[PDB]
Amino acid sequence: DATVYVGGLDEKVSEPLLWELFLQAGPVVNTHMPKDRVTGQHQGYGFVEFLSEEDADYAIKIMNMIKLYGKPIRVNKA
Amino acid sequence: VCEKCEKKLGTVITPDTWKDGARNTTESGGRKLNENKALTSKKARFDPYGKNKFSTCRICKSSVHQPGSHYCQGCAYKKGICAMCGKKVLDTKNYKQTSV
Amino acid sequence: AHKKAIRRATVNTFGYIAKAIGPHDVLATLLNNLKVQERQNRVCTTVAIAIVAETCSPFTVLPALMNEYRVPELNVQNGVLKSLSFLFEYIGEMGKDYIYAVTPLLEDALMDRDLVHRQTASAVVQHMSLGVYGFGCEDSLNHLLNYVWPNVFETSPHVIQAVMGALEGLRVAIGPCRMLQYCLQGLFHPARKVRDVYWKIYNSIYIGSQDALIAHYPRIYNDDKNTYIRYELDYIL
Amino acid sequence: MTDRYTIHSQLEHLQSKYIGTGHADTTKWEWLVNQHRDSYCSYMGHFDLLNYFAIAENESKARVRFNLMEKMLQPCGPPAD
Amino acid sequence: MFLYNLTLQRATGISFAIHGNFSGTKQQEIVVSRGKILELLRPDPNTGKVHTLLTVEVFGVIRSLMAFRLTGGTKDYIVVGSDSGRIVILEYQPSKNMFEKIHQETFGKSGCRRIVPGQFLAVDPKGRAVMISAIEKQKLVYILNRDAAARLTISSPLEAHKANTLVYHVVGVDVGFENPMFACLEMDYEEADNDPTGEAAANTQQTLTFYELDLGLNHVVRKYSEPLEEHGNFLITVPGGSDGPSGVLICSENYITYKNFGDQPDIRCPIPRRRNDLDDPERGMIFVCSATHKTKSMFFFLAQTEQGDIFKITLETDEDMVTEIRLKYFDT
Amino acid sequence: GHRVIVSDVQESFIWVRYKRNENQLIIFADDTYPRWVTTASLLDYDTVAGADKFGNICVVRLPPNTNDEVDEDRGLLNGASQKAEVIMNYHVGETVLSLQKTTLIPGGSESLVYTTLSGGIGILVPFTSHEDHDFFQHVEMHLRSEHPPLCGRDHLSFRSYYFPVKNVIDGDLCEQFNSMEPNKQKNVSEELDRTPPEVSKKLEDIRTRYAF
Amino acid sequence: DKLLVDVDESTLSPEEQKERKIMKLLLKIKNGTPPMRKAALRQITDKAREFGAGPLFNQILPLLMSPTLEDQERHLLVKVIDRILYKLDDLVRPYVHKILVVIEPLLIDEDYYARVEGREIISNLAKAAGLATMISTMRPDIDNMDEYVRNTTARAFAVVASALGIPSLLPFLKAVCKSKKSWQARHTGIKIVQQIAILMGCAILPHLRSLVEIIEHGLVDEQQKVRTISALAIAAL
Amino acid sequence: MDAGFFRGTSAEQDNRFSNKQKKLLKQLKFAECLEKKVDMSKVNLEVIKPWITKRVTEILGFEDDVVIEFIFNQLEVKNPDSKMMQINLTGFLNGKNAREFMGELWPLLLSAQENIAGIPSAFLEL
Amino acid sequence: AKHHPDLIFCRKQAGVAIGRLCEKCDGKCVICDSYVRPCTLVRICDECNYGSYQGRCVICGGPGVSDAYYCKECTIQEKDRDGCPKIVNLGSSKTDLFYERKKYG
Amino acid sequence: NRFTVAELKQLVARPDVVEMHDVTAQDPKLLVHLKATRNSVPVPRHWCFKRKYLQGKRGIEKPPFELPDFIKRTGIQEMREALQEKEEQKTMKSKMREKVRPKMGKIDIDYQKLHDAFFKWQTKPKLTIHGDLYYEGKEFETRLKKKPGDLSDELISLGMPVPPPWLIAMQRYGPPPSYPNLKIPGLNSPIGTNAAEFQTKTEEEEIDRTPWGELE
Ligand SMILES: [Zn+2]
Ligand SMILES: [Zn+2]
Ligand SMILES: [Zn+2]
Ligand SMILES: [Zn+2]
Ligand SMILES: [Zn+2]
């Protein structure tokens, strides 16, 4: 579960902000939030590697708490 | 500078290779053993608070580059004088000094 | 010139001239000369930059020399580093006034990919280290030790002796205790490679400061048949 | 290989000159015997470390110095081979 | 946070004291070492009160101190060994009231190192040489002389080095005007570090070795070497030449021993213990300090034990050699 | 307050905070050097002065950002996560067993008094201006070369026996101005731009307004 | 000549390819341009132990025996010898005497720097082989029938005494000066003492009474050359 | 300059070479008994000499007075170092003959110092 | 020198002889080879001023014309305490130069 | 003959430092004792890497050095930039002709400004405490990782009056398993009684903060 997939985001959101968003729940050890080079903008889906299982199990619940720019965010195991 | 003002000159850190009449060799005594650089720092160098503050030429008012000089290089060359005291070191009646 | 005395008389003359027409006209000429290919020209130009820097105080020639480090040419960048090395050697104790200025330049050079950039920066650290001895500049020097120290596993001899010179300068400026704290973990490391390099740093600290290390050794516990605790220091009055 | 052997000759040269430099194969016992003996010499040298030890044990200083000199022979027990 | 240091009361404990004619006159002074300070004390004979004449701070650790006279000399010089890695020779100037450094000779690195000399300091009783040695494997002899303007001159050091060897004490032997001798309480730890069983540590023994400075050949030679029965802790120079026999008194635990090189057999006297003593019976007894009183007539030693008991020690000479040591309770 | 400063026998100072409503003692800061501590005294809420067996005094301060709100893994360098800065080192020369911050004379200022094992008593007095601090530093640097120690030792090397000397002017060396020769006193006092009575007066003023 | 014929490397044995490799390197050291000479020099130094002390010396030593050397080529060859003498420090024992008869002539060369580099390579050879090997090897040359060999052996013992020290070979030297079968050996031993005093200078003083007692019986000898050399040895001491 | 200044480096100065005497004290295999200390004042030498002469003469296959007198000269000091003597003879003799040679000369000197007369046992017998 | 790794110092116990420097070497430090800030006077061991050699250059060996000093940095690091700083071997560079000129000239 | 990692880890006083290769040491007990001693800095990590130190593809794109701010206050960079931008336009003829007829007073900054840059505006840089060794990726991995119960100003996006919106659900769903000891108000922390914050107020009243011995 150490990693989660996160959908439905707005490009003003940032990886550093994202790390602080999910570390509100529990620390994101490895952050991945693609920067698309071609048009220089984000599609808004994320992958998160944690310390161990602990971060992963919480992950799905952490999704409900999240609400970026008046919108929700998908979090599921991976 | 003139001959009495040469004690006011600064020295180069490395010793001169022509040893005679040098001011910065060990034998001359101007390069002293166990020098503390912090104690001899303000000697013959600019010090805005100290005694040698940033001066300008008395004639042209442009800034000199040597501590304790009252005349800038060009004005001292043209009038024939020592840059520090203003005593004349050259008789320039027959010399059309050319700044070029 | 081939004869060295001609070259050192020439360098001196640059400082005397800069006292008359000012350090900037002289310094621009000398900085332009660093693009030359042959090393004898460039090393002497480097010494002359330091000569003028010392005779006309370093706040005059510092800004332009530090600006020249951004020029995208290798010899110019090695050249500026080389003349800072001579400069700190020349000004001595007076170099506590500019150590904060040139600390970020040196930590940029010590992170550099070129090995030479690292050996000249280590020479600058050696000479700057011994000048500020006794003056409370140990935070800059300890910061620069964090950059100098990973270069101990270099194998090229010129770079390897510049690093060792830097560490021997740092021992007398930030103390034997810090230098022992750096060595400690690798003196008994499994690889001979890490071990003998570490042991030859330890020997240099030991030779130079054998007496001061008495207070700084760690506590080794007793094993089954040998006792290793220094019990006298553990005494309480 | 040859560089190993030249390092070895250089370090045994050092060790003869300054007693108590190590090399890559210093054992624990050797390093600690050196720093014990250096400690003892340092205690003898400084007057107030020797005062402190002569007060903490109720001994006279001559007895203290003589016991430290006795400990210099085998400071950390017998050699571990 | 810039601080300034001041000393209100200087150190008062005493590490070394030497007595001599330092002022150059009839009067006798004492030069005391207070560890970090060197002081000159002159005690009044009629009044009996001690007066402090000089007190100078030397910024170092004074590790040994001796007094030194040149041959036919009135004033005495002070020879200081310290942690500075150099040996200095000082002369008191009464008109100026300051010590004056006469010589400073550099031999080693600074600090209280294990092999750099400075710990032990011994002078030749006639005044021709001085010998400075470290705790182990490093000794150096300096030859002292007078030029035609009566100024002190020093030579290059002559070295006597012996690896793996500990020195407990070094004293200069009073041979008359022969080649200067220096006696030592050496010990060799070389064998002991190569015995895993630990026997070689147990049965290695301290030796007394005599170094002779051969003034003809300008070099120091390790002449005589004799094992001792038990470990001594210091040595006393027996006055010799014309006055008394030339040997060394070795003080060891529970014993005082006279030894000399030659045909003289070693002479041992137990140290008297206190009658009905409350101490632990296992504890031995050593001497902590001594002093020699040399008159022109005769001489004796005053040696103090750990408990504070001062004994007179007097040697009885049957012609050339000594036959017994006599030992008498003086005071506490 | 609720801060505790523990002197380890060889691990130097440790700062521990006591929080009441958890009932626990929490290490929040320490030092980066091994130190054989003999005594300590608190200079303010953030500063500790200490002394070793080896004969040197240090002054350790706590950096301005540190909070003692630590709740009980990481640590730096096998120790606490916050480190204290050493802001003064000084080798006295003789083992100090007592530091105390006090005023000695009526109408004087405070000072840090220490008493050595050998029987000496000294003070460590703080400078109140830069002009004093520059004067005394220049007097010290002249005298280290003009009037070197009598047994062949270096003064900067002596006071930096175990750790480099930091922020202290040795006044025992400075008050040996008055023992120099008059040509040397005049030569030194030229570069301070003062006459030898003025130099003796400034050396005597600081002793007067702190001490005896 | 083996470089002239052309041959596949794989066909011949590892020994023969090793010696062909050494032959190419030596040609580049003798006749090369300074780039070739530098690279070949470096490679024969680094691969010296891998080659072995045997295969080097049986091709280096015939080149120094050639009747057509120039002194710069001789110099380059003995530079090769003392570079590899640091490498195989203990593997040169079977080759000690072979080096001496190719280097001892340099001790009497009329050129000063040849004389000094002959001394340095004999002192390095003494430190590499140790006293016992040196003593056994030079024992035969003391009573040799030619006075050339005796001359240069007496010169070389002085050098070996500088390196290893006089107390080491003072018993052997005493044994060679007392020997009453041959006066050539007595003459040669006293000549060694003379040469030690000329070379060592001040160093011989701590042994002066050991040295004179070896020479005293020669002043009264029945052979007149021996009396002359004893007087010359006394004057040197 | 009467000679050149440069004469080579001594072994105390030059770290490029290892100490060959210590190295040989490690790797040669010495005889069993050479650790016992000998005092030569307690030994009579000229009675020991003809046996040595004969022993070296038959080992060598001829007579070499330099090897003879070298062996004798090493025995002149008060405490003769036996291990150095076996090393110093190893070059001349086989190194196997040197080991045997010390292995019989050394207990003979031990027997000589135990005697009052200075003479070892096998020579008192005969 | 610091520029030649194969050169070797004497390092015996230094004495009362003052070491000197030839015109070529004038003003430089014997150890680290610098031109600035001279701190202490160089002493050489007895053997190194024996006889004819009395008064030659410490660093190269030519006729000495002035006294040799250690610099300030070698004093602070106590490099001035290691021994006699006389160079005892010519080295490869000096020898090569001789044979090269002699070949040509 | 040699320890495996588990026996070594139990035999240390502190088992977090032991690595795979420490068992290969000639004296592994002392090695792990020294690695767990205070204030010692570890061996640089690239000792085992096959690629050479700092010779890595990311290091190709390093930007030029930037001057500090107090030096850019002098205007040296604009002057010297303009100067070298003219000097690439000149031909070799023109450059060698102004070398015989020079031009004075060109690039001169007054001395007082240069002195003030060095003796008034100098600022100490960011420095690193002892044991903070540089390694190759360091300046990119310097983002670190901010703990629950501590929020950033920007995480403004919530726009909620000051408790957390998520908590209204953490009490519902439970305390997260990953954190065993975490404390948040309303679940197991006071918004019992709430006297914890009063303690900090009372102590903060108690303290004098006047640094001893500073300049006047
Ligand atoms: Zn003008
Ligand atoms: Zn004038
Ligand atoms: Zn020269
Ligand atoms: Zn230097
Ligand atoms: Zn020498």
The torsion angles phi and psi of F125, rounded to 5 degrees, stand at -110, 130
Domain region containing H37? 20-125
B84 Cα: distance to centroid of ligand 2 (angstroms): 5
E59 vs F112, F149, F206: nearest CB? F149
CATH for H101? 1.20.1390.10
CB-based neighbours (< 5 A) of ligand 5, an ion:
I 10, 12, 45, 48, 84, 86
Q: Give the gap in angstroms from C-alpha I11 to the nearest C-alpha of chain H.
A: 7
Q: Tell how many helices (H) and how many strands (E) occur in chain H.
A: 6, 0
The torsion angles phi and psi of F39, rounded to 5 degrees, stand at -150, 170
CA-based nearest residue to G95, from G54, G64, G132, G126 = G54
Domain boundaries, given as residue ranges, for chain I:
1-105
* Domain assignment present for H104: yes
What residues in chain F have their Cβ under 8 A from chain J's Cβ atoms?
1-2, 11, 19-21, 32-34, 43-47, 76-79, 83, 101, 110, 126-130
Tokens, residue C148: 């100098």
Chain E to chain I, count of Cβ pairs less than 8 Å apart? 28
Please work out, in degrees rounded to the nearest 5, the angle formed at the alpha carbon of residue F183 by the alpha carbons of F181 and F187: 115
The torsion angles phi and psi of I72, rounded to 5 degrees, stand at -70, -40
Tokens, residue E329: 């309770």
Touch of G by C (3+ CB pairs closer than 8 Å): no
What residues in chain B have their Cβ under 8 A from chain I's Cβ atoms?
13-15, 19, 25-27, 31, 33-35, 37
Residue E80: strand pairing partners:
E65, E88
Neighbouring subunits of B (3+ Cβ pairs under 8 A): C, F, I, J
Q: Give, as one character, the DSSP assignment of residue A36.
A: B
- Reduced to 3 states (helix: H, G, I; strand: E, B; else coil), residue F156 is helix
Residues of E in contact with D77 (CB under 8 A): 198
Residue type, F54: F
Are E3 and J214 within 8 A, CB to CB?
no
C-alpha to C-alpha distance for C72 and D58, rounded to whole angstroms: 72
CA-based nearest residue to G103, from G89, G92, G115 = G115
What residues in chain I have their Cβ under 8 A from chain B's Cβ atoms?
26-27, 35-40, 66-67, 69, 72
Touch of C by I (3+ CB pairs closer than 8 Å): yes
* Domain assignment present for H1: no
B52 Cα: distance to centroid of ligand 1 (angstroms): 18
Neighbouring subunits of G (3+ Cβ pairs under 8 A): D, E, H, I
CA-based nearest residue to G170, from H63, H73, J73 = H73
I30 Cα: distance to centroid of ligand 4 (angstroms): 6
C28 vs J60, J67, J107: nearest CB? J107
C-alpha to C-alpha distance for J76 and C63, rounded to whole angstroms: 6
Binding residues of I for Zn(2+): 10, 22, 25, 29, 32, 45, 48, 57, 60, 71, 74, 84
For β-strands E62-68 and E77-82, DSSP reports them as antiparallel
E109 vs I15, I16, I78: nearest CB? I78
The 10 Å CB-count burial string (b at 16+, else e) for I61-100 is beebebbbbbbbbbbbbbbbbbbbbbbbbbbbebbeebbe
C-alpha to C-alpha distance for E183 and F71, rounded to whole angstroms: 67
C-alpha to C-alpha distance for E131 and A31, rounded to whole angstroms: 73
Are B26 and I37 within 8 A, CB to CB?
no
C-alpha to C-alpha distance for B89 and B80, rounded to whole angstroms: 6
Are H87 and G171 within 8 A, CB to CB?
no
- State whether residue I82 sits within 8 Å of chain G by CB: no
CB atoms within 10 A of CB B30: 15
- State whether residue J142 sits within 8 Å of chain A by CB: no
CB F51 within 8 A of CB F29: no
C-alpha to C-alpha distance for E76 and E69, rounded to whole angstroms: 5
Tokens, residue E195: 């015995």
Residue B83 CA: which ligand is closest? 2
All residues at 6 or more sequence positions from B50 whose CB lies less than 8 Å from its CB, including other chains: B42
DSSP character string of J139-169: TTSTT----TT---S----S------TTHHH
- Number of domains present in the structure of chain E: 1
For β-strands F168-170 and E3-9, DSSP reports them as parallel
Which residue out of J18, J32, J41 would a mutagenesis test of the C interface target, given it has the greatest number of C Cβ atoms within 10 Å? J41
C-alpha distances (whole Å) from H15 to each of D17, G203, G235, J121 are 11, 20, 35, 53
Q: Give the gap in angstroms from C-alpha B23 to the nearest C-alpha of chain F.
A: 20
CB atoms within 10 A of CB D68: 18
> Cα dihedral angle (D32, D38, D41, D46), rounded to 10 degrees?
-110
CA-based nearest residue to C74, from C110, C111, C37, C106 = C37
Provide the CA C79 distance to its chain's centre, in angstroms: 15
* Domain assignment present for H101: yes
Are H5 and I53 within 8 A, CB to CB?
yes
- Number of domains present in the structure of chain H: 1
* Domain assignment present for H59: yes
C-alpha to C-alpha distance for A75 and D3, rounded to whole angstroms: 59
3 state SS for D10-48 = HHHHHHHHCCCCCCCCCCHHHHHHHHHHHHHHHHHHCHH
Q: Is E108 left (phi over 0), alpha (psi -120 to 50) or beta?
A: beta
Residue type, E181: M
CB F95 within 8 A of CB F56: no
Are E1 and F167 within 8 A, CB to CB?
yes
- State whether residue E265 sits within 8 Å of chain C by CB: no
The torsion angles phi and psi of G35, rounded to 5 degrees, stand at -65, -50
The torsion angles phi and psi of J12, rounded to 5 degrees, stand at -75, 155
C-alpha to C-alpha distance for D26 and I22, rounded to whole angstroms: 45
C-alpha to C-alpha distance for E76 and F162, rounded to whole angstroms: 36
What stretch of H or E contains F47?
Answer: strand F47-52
End-to-end Cα separation, chain H, in angstroms: 61
Are F122 and E6 within 8 A, CB to CB?
yes
Tokens 């790390």: give the residue.
A19
C-alpha to C-alpha distance for I62 and I40, rounded to whole angstroms: 22
Residue type, E171: V
CB I69 within 8 A of CB I40: yes
CA-based nearest residue to A58, from A78, A33, A75 = A75
- State whether residue J30 sits within 8 Å of chain D by CB: yes
C-alpha to C-alpha distance for F165 and A16, rounded to whole angstroms: 44
C-alpha to C-alpha distance for E16 and C229, rounded to whole angstroms: 32
Residue type, C229: I
Tokens, residue H45: 């030498």
D5 Cα: distance to centroid of ligand 5 (angstroms): 28
Tokens, residue E308: 């504070």
What stretch of H or E contains J99?
Answer: none
All residues at 6 or more sequence positions from E236 whose CB lies less than 8 Å from its CB, including other chains: E171, E248, E249, E250, E251, E290, E292, E301, E303
All residues at 6 or more sequence positions from J105 whose CB lies less than 8 Å from its CB, including other chains: B62
Residue E98: strand pairing partners:
E93
The torsion angles phi and psi of J169, rounded to 5 degrees, stand at -120, -25
C-alpha to C-alpha distance for C133 and C135, rounded to whole angstroms: 6
Residue J105 CA: which ligand is closest? 1
| Closest chain E CA to residue C207 | E109
Please identify among residues 53-92 of chain I the ones whose CB lies closer than 8 Å to any CB of chain C.
Answer: 72-73, 76-78
CB C100 within 8 A of CB J124: yes
